From Swiss-Prot, chain A:
It is linked to Charcot-Marie-Tooth disease, axonal, type 2O: An axonal form of Charcot-Marie-Tooth disease, a disorder of the peripheral nervous system, characterized by progressive weakness and atrophy, initially of the peroneal muscles and later of the distal muscles of the arms. Charcot-Marie-Tooth disease is classified in two main groups on the basis of electrophysiologic properties and histopathology: primary peripheral demyelinating neuropathies (designated CMT1 when they are dominantly inherited) and primary peripheral axonal neuropathies (CMT2). This is Cytoplasmic dynein 1 heavy chain 1. It comes from the Eukaryota. Homodimer. The cytoplasmic dynein 1 complex consists of two catalytic heavy chains (HCs) and a number of non-catalytic subunits presented by intermediate chains (ICs), light intermediate chains (LICs) and light chains (LCs); the composition seems to vary in respect to the IC, LIC and LC composition. The heavy chain homodimer serves as a scaffold for the probable homodimeric assembly of the respective non-catalytic subunits. The ICs and LICs bind directly to the HC dimer and dynein LCs assemble on the IC dimer. Interacts with DYNC1LI1; DYNC1LI1 and DYNC1LI2 bind mutually exclusive to DYNC1H1.
From Swiss-Prot, chain B:
It is found in: Cytoplasm, Cytoskeleton. Homodimer. The cytoplasmic dynein 1 complex consists of two catalytic heavy chains (HCs) and a number of non-catalytic subunits presented by intermediate chains (ICs), light intermediate chains (LICs) and light chains (LCs); the composition seems to vary in respect to the IC, LIC and LC composition. The heavy chain homodimer serves as a scaffold for the probable homodimeric assembly of the respective non-catalytic subunits. The ICs and LICs bind directly to the HC dimer and dynein LCs assemble on the IC dimer. Interacts with DYNC1LI1; DYNC1LI1 and DYNC1LI2 bind mutually exclusive to DYNC1H1. This is Cytoplasmic dynein 1 heavy chain 1. Transmembrane segments: none annotated. It is linked to Charcot-Marie-Tooth disease, axonal, type 2O: An axonal form of Charcot-Marie-Tooth disease, a disorder of the peripheral nervous system, characterized by progressive weakness and atrophy, initially of the peroneal muscles and later of the distal muscles of the arms. Charcot-Marie-Tooth disease is classified in two main groups on the basis of electrophysiologic properties and histopathology: primary peripheral demyelinating neuropathies (designated CMT1 when they are dominantly inherited) and primary peripheral axonal neuropathies (CMT2). Belongs to the dynein heavy chain family. The lineage of its organism: Eukaryota, Metazoa, Chordata, Craniata, Vertebrata. Cytoplasmic dynein 1 acts as a motor for the intracellular retrograde motility of vesicles and organelles along microtubules. Dynein has ATPase activity; the force-producing power stroke is thought to occur on release of ADP. Plays a role in mitotic spindle assembly and metaphase plate congression. It comes from the Eukaryota.
UniProtKB/Swiss-Prot annotation, chain C:
Residues 263-305 are annotated as: Interaction with DCX. It is found in: Cytoplasm, Cytoskeleton; Cytoplasm, Cytoskeleton, Microtubule organizing center, Centrosome; Cytoplasm, Cytoskeleton, Spindle; Nucleus membrane. The lineage of its organism: Eukaryota, Metazoa, Chordata, Craniata, Vertebrata. This is Platelet-activating factor acetylhydrolase IB subunit beta. The keyword Chaperone does not apply. The modification Phosphoserine is found at residue 19. WD repeats lie at residues 16-57, 58-97, 100-139, 142-177, 180-229, 232-273, 274-306. Originally the subunits of the type I platelet-activating factor (PAF) acetylhydrolase was named alpha (PAFAH1B1), beta (PAFAH1B2) and gamma (PAFAH1B3). Now these subunits have been renamed beta (PAFAH1B1), alpha2 (PAFAH1B2) and alpha1 (PAFAH1B3) respectively. Component of the cytosolic PAF-AH (I) heterotetrameric enzyme, which is composed of PAFAH1B1 (beta), PAFAH1B2 (alpha2) and PAFAH1B3 (alpha1) subunits. The catalytic activity of the enzyme resides in the alpha1 (PAFAH1B3) and alpha2 (PAFAH1B2) subunits, whereas the beta subunit (PAFAH1B1) has regulatory activity. Trimer formation is not essential for the catalytic activity. Belongs to the WD repeat LIS1/nudF family. Residues 284-306 are annotated as: Interaction with NDEL1. Fairly ubiquitous expression in both the frontal and occipital areas of the brain. GO terms for cellular component: 1-alkyl-2-acetylglycerophosphocholine esterase complex; astral microtubule; axon cytoplasm; cell cortex; cell leading edge; central region of growth cone; centrosome; cytoplasmic microtubule.
Amino acid sequence: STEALYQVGKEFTSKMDLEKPNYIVPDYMPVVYDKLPQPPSHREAIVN
Amino acid sequence: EEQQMHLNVGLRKIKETVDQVEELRRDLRIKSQELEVKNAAANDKLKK
Amino acid sequence: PKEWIPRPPEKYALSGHRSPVTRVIFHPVFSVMVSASEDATIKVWDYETGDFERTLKGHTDSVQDISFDHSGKLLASCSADMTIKLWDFQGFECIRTMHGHDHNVSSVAIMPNGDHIVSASRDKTIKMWEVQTGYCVKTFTGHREWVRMVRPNQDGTLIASCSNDQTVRVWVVCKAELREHEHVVECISWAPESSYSSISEATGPFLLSGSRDKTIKMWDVSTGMCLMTLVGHDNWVRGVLFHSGGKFILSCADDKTLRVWDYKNKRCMKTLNAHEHFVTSLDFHKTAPYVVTGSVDQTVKVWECR
């Protein structure tokens, strides 16, 4: 499922440096995973 | 990161070379001064 | 477990290095020690055996200071590329890099609660970060020169930092300012809870700090006055620390000697010819009988404590 793909991606890339503190959340942000944490972070954007 | 570290070390050697050139310029200045002093003393001695 | 004083000669000489060593610390749990350097490398050694374990590359300039988590599973390092890199001791990989300092960072330390990171750079500011996401929370101002070392307290509420402004400021998340210095203060050592009775017999929390004024002096944060002045160093003092039992004082300087002091009489008992050049840092194991000194002659040496 899309939730399975998101969880696999998040757990695999939890070890990588994907944090951008000055991340500007876009107005649109086309979401493919429902129930994504709004507002998202850079890591959530990468996994999405 | 490895390339950036190698570039950042490389500029320190250029700074050290600049400092060495400046100190050698000062050394040649003082050596020319003492050379002129010696030549003046020799000329005065020959005049005597 | 109180008579532990380093004795000649060196037990192990970890010379497997190529650049000067700045900081050395002990693991709170495992039987390993790590060492910072000038060539952007942090190397892990086994002080019991003397064998080189692994290196942690990933910095792009000289590493200044390193510190461990309370649990020992998290390592924070600061370097001269204006970064506070975070390391873990599970897979030995970089977790997050924190930017925000305007120049060379000279100190770092994990808060005792294991959630925030303190830092001190040349831009005369003290920064607090989040271990979860690398986002800065607070900034501290009040210094006007190079800030060398910053060391927290045992509760995570009191923070002491030393600078080139002839001051040792203390902040509460400024509690006190100490401006009776005569040169640049370089290193800060906090007094553990196992020394209050000893110093009451001889004379909290207490603060001890060396400096480039060839002497060590120690204050009280509750009063802001110097208690005792420890003098006798022949060169610039680089590192100081309390004994694990809270009875002796360990310190190092550029005179290539380890002088073990005490506040009972304020005199030197034995000076150790450690290295052929200056000594940059040292650490004392909290339970094991070992002393390691990190020196600027590209060698790391471990001393038995008898």
